[PDB]
């Protein structure tokens, strides 16, 4: 159980360390928000005393991100809780932690490129190589080793999901 | 032999002064 919160410490740690070094600023932005935005998502609503006025939880930062950037402040990122008042399985907490990162001049090529060799320099020092054991369904289960080695594979939603119904979509 | 006189120090246990000491340390987990 320690093992795996120190493997969660090093992966933060790694993430902060990266952008550091690509020259993003650590920033924090409002966790209580008048209007919530940057997902889809249920919020949380609570009431501010001094202000006299509800107020959301935040569900995303993003907002605040790129107004930064407007703000001239070219590379930022966060490391932080979001909360999502929704449901609870293997896959969703109501309060969880994300990383977001923004990046001026850059596009979507370039954080496909950013992404392979963040998450795959990540897997290797942290677990000394690209290809990861993972049971799906348990340890009473199978397992399958993830190979994170870049490139990853690419997909584009129409035409995929076109060739997996067998049938053509509109335009 | 001469007759037994017990030490000035009481004859407990020998002296065991404190000395000064210093926080251990745990390594970087990240290092
Ligand atoms: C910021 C986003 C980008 C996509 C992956 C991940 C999605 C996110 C959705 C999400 C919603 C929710 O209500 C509760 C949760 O624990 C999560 C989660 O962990 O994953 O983080």
Redesign the interface.
């Known amino acids: 159980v320690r093992q795996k919160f120190?493997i969660r410490?090093?992966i933060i740690?790694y993430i902060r360390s990266f952008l550091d070094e690509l020259g993003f600023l650590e920033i924090e932005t409002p966790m209580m928000n008048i209007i919530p935005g940057g997902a889809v998502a249920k919020p949380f609503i609570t009431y501010h005393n001094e202000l006299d006025m509800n107020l959301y939880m935040r569900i995303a930062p993003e907002l605040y991100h790129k107004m930064l950037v407007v703000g001239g402040i070219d590379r930022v990122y966060e490391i932080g809780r979001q909360f999502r008042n929704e449901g609870i399985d293997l896959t969703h907490n109501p309060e969880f932690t994300t990383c977001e990162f923004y990046m001026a001049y850059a596009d979507y090529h370039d954080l496909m490129e950013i992404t392979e060799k963040m998450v795959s320099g990540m897997v290797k020092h942290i677990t000394g190589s690209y290809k990861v054991t993972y049971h799906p369904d348990g340890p009473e289960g199978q397992a399958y080793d993830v190979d994170f080695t870049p490139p990853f594979r690419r997909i584009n939603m129409v035409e995929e999901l076109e060739k997996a119904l067998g049938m053509k979509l509109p335009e | 032999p001469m007759y037994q006189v017990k030490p000035y120090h009481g004859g407990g246990a020998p002296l065991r002064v404190e000395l000064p000491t210093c926080m251990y340390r745990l390594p970087n987990?990240?290092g």
Do not use: G, L
């Open positions: 120190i410490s090093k740690t | 987990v990240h």
